[PDB]
Symmetry: C2
Subunit: 126 residues, 2 copies
């Protein structure tokens, strides 16, 4: 079950979603109109783990999502996503994803959430 979380974590309406993908591995955040991504190459991911020490990012991110310990800074075409939980706070630089690239991902994201809801509501009934 692909981890994600929403911001603000309050009862206020969520204004952003943060999620991640396969370990092509990446972090994403969107306000559902624009999409920001870490945009990792397999080289720069290792560089990141190395700067930070490792060797899997997903569990740290899952852990921050559960704790609602994710911090988000957005200015323009650049974002930063911060993970608190582990030994060192983790920060990620994100760049805005061009519309034609972001678009099929946003489409797939929404349709995928819905299938998760339908499915989760099934399971919960059991």
């Amino acid at each position: 079950s692909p981890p994600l979380c929403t911001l603000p974590p309050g009862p206020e309406p969520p204004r952003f979603v943060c999620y991640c993908e396969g370990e092509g591995f990446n972090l994403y955040v969107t306000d559902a109109a624009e999409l920001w991504s870490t945009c990792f190459t397999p080289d720069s991911l290792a560089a990141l783990k190395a700067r930070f020490g490792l060797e899997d990012i997903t569990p740290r991110f899952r852990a921050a999502c559960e704790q609602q310990a994710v911090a988000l800074t957005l200015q323009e075409d650049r974002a930063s996503l911060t993970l608190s939980g582990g030994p060192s706070a983790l920060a990620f630089d994100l760049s805005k994803v061009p519309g034609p690239e972001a678009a099929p991902r946003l489409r797939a994201l929404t349709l995928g959430l819905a299938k998760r809801v339908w499915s989760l509501e099934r399971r919960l009934a059991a």
Copy 2:
């Protein structure tokens, strides 16, 4: 929590979401179907809702939401697209209900989809939170 389902039912990747709104401030009922690119709605008026509920022998004070919820549960929802227009069929129950949908305009459709994506994610996070307990 608000009823929805995805199509196609089964293991294949979803191409469409069906959901509904209203019948709580209580707002008029509408059904919405989307491929997450375009949005369609029942675009009900009070007259058209009465006329639909008559077309299939339902009453004015009757909520439609429970039957839609029942179609969603059983994945007994049928969809047609002329692109220009749509049909939705509910077969969750004893009697089938068919709906005419038209395209929702952009300046209204766009903010509804954003809210849908974000709302699902809240729902997912909350549901997945609510599930770990049992």
